[PDB]
Design a protein around this nucleic acid. Sequence first.
RNA 1: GGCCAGGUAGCUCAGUCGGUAUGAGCGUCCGCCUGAAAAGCGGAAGGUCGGCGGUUCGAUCCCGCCCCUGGCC
Length: 49
Amino acid sequence: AMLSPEALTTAVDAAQQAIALADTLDVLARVKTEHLGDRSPLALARQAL
RNA sequence: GGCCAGGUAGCUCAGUCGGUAUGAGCGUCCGCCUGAAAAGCGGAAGGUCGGCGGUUCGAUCCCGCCCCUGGCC
């Protein structure tokens, strides 16, 4: 199982950093697809059904 | 007032009684291509699955109410 407490924490850190680095709304839609969509690493944590 | 059967992407519609709707056709975007296009090929974006709540670590899928449609009255 690849869902250690140090795995989800680092994945969110890369997500919140890219979300905070989103300067315009068009970049936020790109970051949302890479960190909150159905293909994001956090989605893979939920893809592991 | 009765059990039901339906509301799902921009349009028209499939599909699951619990963790991915690997949704389809068309519509939108990018690349190859063209003077510029389209088709073709190769990549993608986009749904909070009818609303408000209830159970659950987790609900499009189960309880309740209602919003709106047919059905049969």
